[PDB]
Structures are given as structure tokens and as C-alpha cells.
Amino acid sequence: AMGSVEHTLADVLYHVETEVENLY
Amino acid sequence: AMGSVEHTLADVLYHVETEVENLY
Amino acid sequence: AMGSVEHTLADVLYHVETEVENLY
Amino acid sequence: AMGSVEHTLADVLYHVETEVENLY
Amino acid sequence: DLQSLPTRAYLDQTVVPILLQGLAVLAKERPPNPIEFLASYLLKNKAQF
Amino acid sequence: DLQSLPTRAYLDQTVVPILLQGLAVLAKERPPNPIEFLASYLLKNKAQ
Amino acid sequence: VDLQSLPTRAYLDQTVVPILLQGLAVLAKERPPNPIEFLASYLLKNKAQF
Amino acid sequence: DLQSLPTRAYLDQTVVPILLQGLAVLAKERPPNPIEFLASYLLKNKAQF
Amino acid sequence: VDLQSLPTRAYLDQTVVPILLQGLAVLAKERPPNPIEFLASYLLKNKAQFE
Amino acid sequence: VDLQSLPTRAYLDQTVVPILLQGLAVLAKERPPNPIEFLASYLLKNKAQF
Amino acid sequence: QSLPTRAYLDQTVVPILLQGLAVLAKERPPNPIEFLASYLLKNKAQF
Amino acid sequence: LQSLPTRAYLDQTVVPILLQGLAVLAKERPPNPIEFLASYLLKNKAQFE
């Protein structure tokens, strides 16, 4: 299930990219 | 105030990118 | 497995209680 | 913005109840 | 009661248990009409919840 | 596919959007028979 | 509930986020020659449903 | 080319910037018809992207 | 069901959620140099009113 | 990096949300006799790591 | 364990990956992969 | 590189090898998960940079 791994990494990337230090 | 907008768009992109049709 | 199902319903409930109409 | 506070706490609670140890 | 409860507590006192069991059965069998099937589960088991 | 999806992905691809909309409306209306109201919503809205 | 006084994120979430989710989903699936025009057309053609 | 890009990269190379500016203007002004306003922003500023 | 045997959500809702709501509200309003210390102190200064 | 001007949600997420995540997780797991006191003490005792 | 993939990764490596990639994005060293591996090994104990 | 947005940077540096790493990790499930991932990263680094 490559999809699950990709979803997991997407969660990680999303949280990193949406860090307050990264947005503002 | 760009941070809130960028955050919103990030949510959108996340949901689009993790669609089941795209992952599996 | 009930864990996955309960996780799903948890997502659903989270979105419902955090609907803009319910918070504000 | 009490809605914002409730949304934040909702995020926290959601995360806590969806810990794998609480689900599985 | 019910009506004056917070959103989550309301759903928890009304539809969450039957939805948990319903989604469990749905996820296990995976029938051709998942939504209709879920609704039918809800209706066929309402009295017990 | 479908059959072989993980459970979360399966439920998310089948019933979760309509459940989101349904439980939202349910929470708004708060009828005397919540289960019948929800099943009925799912049924009235199945096509979409 | 007034929309004028909502925080930015909540405002955008209550106005355009749902239609954008499905719009960008369809966009990503189809990938038309004129992406911006296609997205705008999607928004206009489905606004009523949101 | 675009056709062969991953989802995120495709959207980043096509519609993300104009959406940032559009959603920014939308959030600032908050017009009575937000979806139509956003679509109109996209159309009125497409040329710069 | 006693606290101990409640599901995670119900337990937190009956224990710390209200005081956390008020605490975070005041915190968000004041925005002190030490937000965590401020929140803990709020919790202590209002414990009795929240059981 | 100016906290002061952040939206409420972003402020709380940049200040107290992580420690609250770990704190309520521990709280839900242990369930002490005095949850509010226990929580305040958790925040004070782990403040430095956050 | 007997966990689904996502739950397994969420219980094992996701938090340390969150903090690791955040730090990576902040610093952006000449050695992204080596820096990340080193972050995981040096902070393994806290997770 | 230096000048990329957060996501594009992570995509150009560590995302592919992390995909392969998490795939193997999820498949094998060692007692070793974090150490195994770091070691995977190190042992396959050359093919990814």
C-alpha cells in the first residue's frame, strides 16, 4: 500500500509547511 | 496577513493531493 | 479493525464540531 | 475570537483521542 | 438535555455508537451500495440504540 | 480499486463526505429521532 | 453569525474552501490547457451548489 | 512539461499564485458574492500569470 | 461511568476543557512574555471555580 | 516573527498547543485525582523543553 | 505491531520526522539527507 | 535550492528517499524503526543525490 506511505508523508509535509514560522 | 491565506491554500492543496483516487 | 473506524468517525466529528457555524 | 480558542482546543482533543494507543 | 448539549456530546449521545458498528460492518463486507447500506443498517438497528 | 483499500481510505472514499454533511445538518437540526433523520439524509443525498 | 468579522482562515473556509477542494481536485485530474480559466469556469458553474 | 507533474507541483505551476493573491483580496474585501468574486479575480488577473 | 472509565474525549471534557477554554481565551487576549507559565498560573488561580 | 500580531489560532499553536498535546495525552492516560492541578504542574515542569 | 501502515508510521517515526524536517527546512544544510539521518539518530532517545 | 519554498525544497532533497524508506520500514517493521530509517537514509543516500 504505497498510498498509505504517501499519505503519511503528505501529513508530515503539510505540518512542516504550515508551521507558524514558515507562514508568517 | 498573508500567512492565514497561505495556510488556507495549504489545507486545500493537502486535501487535493491526498485524494484516494490519487494515492491508491 | 475498530481502531481505523473509530479514527474515521473521529475525523468526521472533529470537522462537524469545528464547522464555522458551530464555533462562531 | 472564542471560536478560535474552541477550534484550537478541538485540535488538541482530536489529536489526543486519536493517539494510536487510544484507538487500538 | 440533547438540544442544549455541545455538538460532540449531542452526536455522542445520539448517533455515534450505531455509526461505529455500522461503519465496522460496512468496512468489513464492502457492499455495492455503501451509503444505502449504511442507512439501512442505521434503520434496521435504531431500536437497539 | 476499492475492495483492497485500507479501511480508513475505504470509508473516506465511500461514506465520509456525505457523513460530514449529514452529521453537520443533524447537529444543526437536532430532531426527535436522530438516527432516522441521518439515515434519511444519507438516502435523500446518496446520488451526490 | 456574521462573516464580516470572522478571522481570515475561518472566513475563507466558510466561503470558498469547499468549492476549491473539488475544483482543484477536478483540475488536477483533467489538467486542461488553460488551468486558470478552467478553474474560474468551474467556480462560476458550481457556485450555486455552495 | 506540466502533464507529467505530481499533483502539488502541477497546481503550484498553474494556479497557486493567482489563488494566493485572489484569496488575499477576497479576505480583505469580503464581498457579498465571494465565489463569483474569486472567479472574477482569476479571470481579471490571469494575464499576469 | 466514573471519570476513570470514560472515553478520552468525555474525560477531558469533564476535567480540564472548560478551564482550558477560559485560560486560552485570556492568554490569547493578553499575550504575555511567558504564555505557558501564564496558562499554568491561570489554571491554578481558577481551579476551585472549575472543581 | 511577531507573535503579538498573529491570529488567535496561530498564536496558541505557536505558544501552548504542543505542550498541551503532550500534557492532555499524559493526563488522559494517567487520570490523576486532581486533573487541573496535575495539568498546571505538567505545563510548569515541561515548559523549558517547549 | 498488527497496525495498519499509517497508524504504524504515526506511532513510530512521524513525530520525530515532523521535528526533523521542520529543522531541515529551517537550516537547509549542504547535506540534507545526512543531516536528516543524523537528526533521527541524535534525537532517537526522545521518541 | 536555498531560495525554494519549504515544500519544493523538501521535495528536491529528502522526499523521494523518505518515500522509499518509509515503504521499506512499513513493510519490515523492525524493533528498530527510527535507527533503521536513519541507516536506510545513509545506506541509500548515493542513489538519491
Side-chain angles (χ1 to χ4, degrees), chain A residues 1-20 22-24, chain B residues 1 3-5 7-18 20 22-24, chain C residues 1-18 20 22-24, chain D residues 1-20 22-24, chain E residues 1-27 29-35 37-43 45 47-49, chain F residues 1-2 4-27 29-47, chain G residues 3-28 30-33 35-44 46-48 50, chain H residues 1-12 14-27 29-35 37-45 47 49, chain I residues 2-28 31-33 35-50, chain J residues 3-28 31-43 46-50, chain K residues 1-9 11-25 28-41 43-47, chain L residues 1 3-11 13-26 29-34 36-44 46 48-49:
Chain A
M2 186 63 195
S4 289
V5 167
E6 282 169 331
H7 199 167
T8 297
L9 192 54
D11 287 10
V12 178
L13 296 169
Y14 166 84
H15 285 297
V16 172
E17 157 178 43
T18 57
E19 281 294 87
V20 172
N22 281 235
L23 299 171
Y24 303 85
Chain B
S4 289
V5 169
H7 200 334
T8 297
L9 192 54
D11 287 11
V12 179
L13 295 169
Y14 166 84
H15 290 75
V16 173
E17 160 179 45
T18 56
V20 172
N22 167 5
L23 297 171
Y24 305 90
Chain C
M2 278 296 300
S4 290
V5 168
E6 187 175 333
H7 199 336
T8 296
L9 193 53
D11 287 12
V12 178
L13 296 169
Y14 164 84
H15 294 96
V16 175
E17 77 171 312
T18 57
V20 171
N22 281 337
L23 300 171
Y24 304 92
Chain D
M2 186 63 68
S4 289
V5 169
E6 286 174 311
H7 202 334
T8 295
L9 191 54
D11 288 11
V12 180
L13 298 170
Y14 163 83
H15 160 268
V16 174
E17 78 171 312
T18 56
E19 281 294 79
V20 314
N22 281 337
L23 298 169
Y24 303 85
Chain E
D1 199 68
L2 283 175
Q3 236 146 28
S4 58
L5 290 178
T7 305
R8 174 132 183 183
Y10 171 75
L11 298 173
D12 277 335
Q13 302 303 313
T14 54
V15 294
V16 164
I18 193 174
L19 276 183
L20 285 175
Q21 295 299 100
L23 293 173
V25 171
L26 181 65
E29 184 63 15
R30 309 196 178 192
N33 297 337
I35 295 173
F37 180 84
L38 182 58
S40 295
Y41 186 96
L42 290 183
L43 288 175
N45 295 274
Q48 307 173 355
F49 290 81
Chain F
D1 192 342
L2 215 58
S4 58
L5 290 177
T7 303
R8 278 180 72 199
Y10 171 76
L11 299 172
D12 277 330
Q13 176 63 18
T14 53
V15 294
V16 163
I18 191 174
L19 277 182
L20 288 175
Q21 300 300 321
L23 293 175
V25 171
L26 180 65
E29 290 299 324
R30 306 198 176 194
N33 295 338
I35 295 173
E36 284 178 357
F37 181 86
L38 182 58
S40 164
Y41 185 94
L42 291 183
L43 289 175
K44 300 182 159 152
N45 298 20
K46 61 178 302 176
Chain G
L3 284 177
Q4 297 297 331
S5 58
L6 289 178
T8 303
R9 278 179 72 199
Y11 174 77
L12 298 173
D13 173 26
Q14 178 62 18
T15 54
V16 294
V17 160
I19 191 174
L20 277 183
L21 289 176
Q22 303 199 358
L24 293 176
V26 170
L27 182 66
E30 288 194 33
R31 307 197 177 193
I36 294 174
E37 288 176 8
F38 182 87
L39 181 58
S41 296
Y42 184 97
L43 289 183
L44 290 175
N46 297 275
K47 61 177 176 183
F50 292 94
Chain H
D1 58 27
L2 283 58
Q3 325 76 336
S4 59
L5 289 177
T7 304
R8 180 67 170 86
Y10 174 77
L11 296 172
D12 275 335
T14 51
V15 293
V16 159
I18 193 174
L19 275 182
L20 284 175
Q21 298 184 347
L23 293 173
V25 170
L26 182 65
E29 288 194 33
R30 308 196 177 193
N33 304 131
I35 296 173
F37 181 90
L38 182 59
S40 295
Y41 185 95
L42 290 182
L43 289 175
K44 295 182 300 170
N45 296 275
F49 291 95
Chain I
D2 180 346
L3 283 177
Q4 299 299 110
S5 58
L6 290 176
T8 306
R9 172 65 178 239
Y11 173 76
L12 297 172
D13 277 335
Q14 271 131 353
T15 51
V16 293
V17 161
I19 191 174
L20 277 183
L21 285 175
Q22 234 69 37
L24 293 175
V26 171
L27 180 64
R31 307 196 176 192
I36 295 173
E37 287 178 8
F38 181 91
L39 183 57
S41 294
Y42 184 95
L43 289 182
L44 290 176
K45 298 183 13 183
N46 294 274
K47 171 204 155 318
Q49 297 71 1
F50 288 85
Chain J
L3 281 59
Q4 296 298 332
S5 58
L6 291 177
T8 306
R9 279 177 72 199
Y11 175 75
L12 297 173
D13 276 291
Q14 178 65 18
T15 52
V16 293
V17 161
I19 193 174
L20 276 181
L21 288 176
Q22 295 301 321
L24 294 179
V26 168
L27 182 65
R31 308 197 177 193
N34 295 285
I36 296 172
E37 155 175 34
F38 180 90
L39 181 59
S41 295
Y42 188 97
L43 283 39
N46 295 275
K47 166 205 153 317
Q49 177 192 336
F50 290 91
Chain K
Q1 246 196 36
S2 164
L3 292 177
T5 303
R6 279 182 73 198
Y8 171 77
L9 297 172
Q11 175 62 16
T12 53
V13 293
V14 160
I16 193 174
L17 276 182
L18 288 176
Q19 298 222 304
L21 293 176
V23 171
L24 181 65
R28 307 197 177 193
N31 38 350
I33 297 173
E34 163 175 23
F35 182 92
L36 182 59
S38 295
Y39 188 96
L40 283 39
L41 288 176
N43 295 274
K44 170 205 323 165
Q46 173 192 332
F47 293 91
Chain L
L1 214 57
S3 165
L4 291 178
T6 305
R7 174 130 185 181
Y9 173 75
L10 297 173
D11 276 335
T13 52
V14 294
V15 161
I17 193 174
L18 277 183
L19 285 174
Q20 299 300 319
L22 294 174
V24 172
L25 181 64
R29 306 196 176 193
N32 292 238
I34 297 173
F36 178 63
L37 182 58
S39 58
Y40 185 96
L41 289 181
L42 290 175
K43 102 161 158 59
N44 297 340
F48 288 81
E49 64 181 300

XYZ file of all heavy atoms in Angstrom, chain F residues 4-43, unseen atoms left out:
308
model
N -9.601 -3.575 -1.935
C -8.284 -3.722 -1.313
C -7.750 -2.456 -0.630
O -6.604 -2.439 -0.177
C -7.267 -4.186 -2.357
O -7.197 -3.272 -3.437
N -8.563 -1.402 -0.558
C -8.134 -0.175 0.107
C -8.014 -0.427 1.598
O -8.713 -1.288 2.134
C -9.124 0.972 -0.134
C -9.278 1.641 -1.497
C -10.378 2.688 -1.442
C -7.974 2.286 -1.887
N -7.113 0.305 2.276
C -7.162 0.258 3.740
C -8.502 0.795 4.227
O -9.100 1.637 3.552
C -6.011 1.181 4.169
C -5.100 1.239 2.988
C -5.996 1.126 1.782
N -8.943 0.333 5.387
C -10.249 0.696 5.930
C -10.524 2.199 5.936
O -11.585 2.639 5.486
C -10.423 0.165 7.354
O -10.233 -1.255 7.356
C -11.818 0.481 7.863
N -9.582 2.983 6.457
C -9.791 4.423 6.566
C -10.018 5.010 5.183
O -10.961 5.772 4.980
C -8.603 5.100 7.252
C -8.664 5.011 8.774
C -7.483 5.689 9.450
N -7.554 7.144 9.368
C -6.512 7.948 9.547
N -5.318 7.435 9.811
N -6.660 9.265 9.457
N -9.177 4.614 4.230
C -9.273 5.087 2.852
C -10.575 4.629 2.210
O -11.191 5.371 1.446
C -8.079 4.598 2.032
N -10.993 3.406 2.522
C -12.255 2.886 2.008
C -13.451 3.718 2.465
O -14.272 4.159 1.647
C -12.460 1.436 2.441
C -13.843 0.950 2.104
C -14.188 0.623 0.799
C -14.823 0.869 3.084
C -15.462 0.199 0.487
C -16.099 0.443 2.780
C -16.414 0.112 1.480
O -17.687 -0.306 1.178
N -13.545 3.924 3.775
C -14.642 4.698 4.343
C -14.602 6.149 3.875
O -15.636 6.775 3.667
C -14.584 4.645 5.870
C -14.711 3.252 6.478
C -14.450 3.321 7.974
C -16.080 2.674 6.180
N -13.390 6.659 3.691
C -13.193 8.027 3.243
C -13.612 8.191 1.793
O -14.089 9.253 1.394
C -11.739 8.463 3.428
C -11.439 8.949 4.841
O -12.352 9.485 5.494
O -10.293 8.769 5.317
N -13.454 7.127 1.013
C -13.798 7.157 -0.403
C -15.267 6.794 -0.619
O -15.816 7.014 -1.697
C -12.888 6.199 -1.184
C -13.194 6.061 -2.671
C -13.008 7.354 -3.444
O -12.353 8.284 -2.978
N -13.596 7.420 -4.632
N -15.924 6.277 0.412
C -17.315 5.870 0.233
C -18.329 6.768 0.947
O -19.166 7.391 0.296
C -17.532 4.414 0.698
O -17.056 4.256 2.043
C -16.790 3.456 -0.216
N -18.250 6.854 2.272
C -19.339 7.456 3.039
C -18.987 8.711 3.841
O -19.877 9.402 4.330
C -19.918 6.433 4.027
C -20.598 5.295 3.276
C -18.815 5.905 4.943
N -17.702 9.004 3.982
C -17.268 10.125 4.820
C -17.757 11.520 4.365
O -18.200 12.288 5.204
C -15.733 10.112 4.978
C -15.220 11.452 5.475
C -15.347 9.017 5.954
N -17.685 11.863 3.060
C -18.183 13.211 2.734
C -19.658 13.421 3.106
O -20.033 14.425 3.745
C -18.006 13.288 1.212
C -16.896 12.343 0.921
C -17.091 11.206 1.880
N -20.485 12.446 2.743
C -21.907 12.562 2.995
C -22.169 12.500 4.501
O -23.103 13.120 4.987
C -22.718 11.471 2.244
C -24.212 11.781 2.307
C -22.452 10.084 2.804
C -25.066 10.838 1.487
N -21.334 11.778 5.243
C -21.463 11.735 6.698
C -21.090 13.081 7.316
O -21.675 13.497 8.308
C -20.603 10.613 7.287
C -21.236 9.217 7.277
C -20.310 8.201 7.916
C -22.588 9.222 7.983
N -20.098 13.745 6.735
C -19.691 15.074 7.174
C -20.887 16.013 7.061
O -21.286 16.676 8.039
C -18.523 15.589 6.325
C -17.143 14.948 6.519
C -16.136 15.500 5.520
C -16.637 15.134 7.932
N -21.511 15.990 5.882
C -22.613 16.905 5.607
C -23.828 16.555 6.472
O -24.493 17.431 7.044
C -23.014 16.812 4.128
C -21.924 17.157 3.120
C -21.402 18.568 3.264
O -22.164 19.499 3.520
N -20.094 18.735 3.096
N -24.067 15.253 6.601
C -25.172 14.702 7.364
C -25.132 14.952 8.855
O -26.115 15.380 9.444
N -24.002 14.646 9.476
C -23.830 14.899 10.900
C -23.799 16.402 11.176
O -24.215 16.843 12.252
C -22.565 14.218 11.425
C -22.617 12.686 11.402
C -21.294 12.085 11.821
C -23.728 12.178 12.297
N -23.308 17.192 10.220
C -23.374 18.643 10.389
C -24.833 19.111 10.460
O -25.234 19.814 11.404
C -22.645 19.348 9.260
N -25.632 18.686 9.480
C -27.042 19.072 9.432
C -27.794 18.543 10.650
O -28.614 19.244 11.233
C -27.736 18.574 8.151
C -29.234 18.808 8.236
C -27.167 19.282 6.935
N -27.504 17.303 11.027
C -28.083 16.686 12.215
C -27.800 17.526 13.454
O -28.699 17.790 14.252
C -27.539 15.271 12.405
C -28.070 14.497 13.611
C -29.556 14.234 13.482
C -27.303 13.200 13.780
N -26.543 17.933 13.614
C -26.140 18.754 14.752
C -26.880 20.090 14.740
O -27.185 20.646 15.794
C -24.639 18.977 14.743
N -27.162 20.603 13.545
C -27.901 21.861 13.414
C -29.391 21.719 13.770
O -29.951 22.560 14.474
C -27.760 22.417 11.995
N -30.029 20.664 13.271
C -31.475 20.487 13.409
C -31.889 19.897 14.758
O -32.839 20.365 15.387
C -31.994 19.567 12.296
C -31.982 20.159 10.891
C -32.851 21.392 10.753
O -33.919 21.451 11.397
O -32.464 22.302 9.990
N -31.159 18.872 15.188
C -31.450 18.128 16.417
C -32.911 17.666 16.538
O -33.650 18.153 17.394
C -31.048 18.960 17.640
C -29.604 19.426 17.552
C -29.028 19.867 18.880
N -27.616 20.202 18.726
C -26.768 20.369 19.734
N -27.183 20.225 20.985
N -25.498 20.669 19.491
N -33.322 16.720 15.670
C -34.665 16.124 15.587
C -34.930 15.085 16.684
O -33.980 14.644 17.329
C -34.656 15.468 14.206
C -33.257 15.062 14.023
C -32.413 16.119 14.677
N -36.206 14.712 16.902
C -36.552 13.713 17.927
C -35.991 12.309 17.657
O -35.760 11.563 18.608
C -38.085 13.684 17.899
C -38.505 14.918 17.190
C -37.397 15.316 16.279
N -35.815 11.946 16.391
C -35.240 10.651 16.036
C -34.006 10.796 15.149
O -34.098 10.679 13.918
C -36.268 9.735 15.351
C -37.411 9.346 16.273
O -37.278 9.388 17.503
N -38.529 8.944 15.691
N -32.855 11.081 15.773
C -31.608 11.434 15.091
C -31.158 10.357 14.104
O -30.668 10.681 13.024
C -30.607 11.578 16.241
C -31.435 11.877 17.435
C -32.705 11.097 17.239
N -31.310 9.091 14.476
C -30.850 8.004 13.623
C -31.676 7.939 12.340
O -31.122 7.864 11.240
C -30.926 6.652 14.353
C -29.958 6.643 15.536
C -30.640 5.500 13.390
C -30.089 5.426 16.420
N -32.997 8.017 12.476
C -33.868 8.026 11.305
C -33.598 9.263 10.454
O -33.572 9.180 9.225
C -35.346 7.945 11.705
C -35.791 6.548 12.127
C -37.242 6.490 12.571
O -37.903 7.548 12.612
O -37.734 5.375 12.846
N -33.387 10.405 11.099
C -33.073 11.623 10.359
C -31.780 11.468 9.550
O -31.717 11.878 8.392
C -32.965 12.815 11.310
C -32.662 14.112 10.617
C -33.683 14.892 10.100
C -31.355 14.544 10.473
C -33.404 16.082 9.456
C -31.069 15.728 9.832
C -32.093 16.500 9.322
N -30.756 10.867 10.151
C -29.482 10.684 9.459
C -29.587 9.700 8.299
O -29.121 9.979 7.196
C -28.399 10.208 10.428
C -27.015 10.044 9.796
C -26.573 11.368 9.191
C -25.996 9.563 10.818
N -30.220 8.555 8.553
C -30.399 7.543 7.519
C -31.159 8.155 6.350
O -30.804 7.964 5.182
C -31.140 6.331 8.070
N -32.173 8.945 6.688
C -32.994 9.599 5.691
C -32.166 10.612 4.903
O -32.282 10.676 3.685
C -34.193 10.283 6.362
O -34.815 11.216 5.501
N -31.277 11.344 5.573
C -30.397 12.286 4.872
C -29.485 11.580 3.876
O -29.378 11.979 2.710
C -29.566 13.075 5.884
C -28.693 14.170 5.298
C -29.146 15.481 5.228
C -27.427 13.889 4.793
C -28.357 16.487 4.690
C -26.628 14.889 4.258
C -27.100 16.187 4.211
O -26.316 17.184 3.676
N -28.871 10.501 4.347
C -27.971 9.690 3.546
C -28.724 9.213 2.308
O -28.182 9.177 1.204
C -27.449 8.496 4.348
C -26.482 8.773 5.505
C -26.025 7.470 6.138
C -25.288 9.632 5.095
N -29.978 8.823 2.508
C -30.796 8.323 1.412
C -31.201 9.417 0.413
O -31.177 9.193 -0.789
C -32.045 7.632 1.958
C -31.865 6.286 2.666
C -33.185 5.782 3.252
C -31.268 5.252 1.727
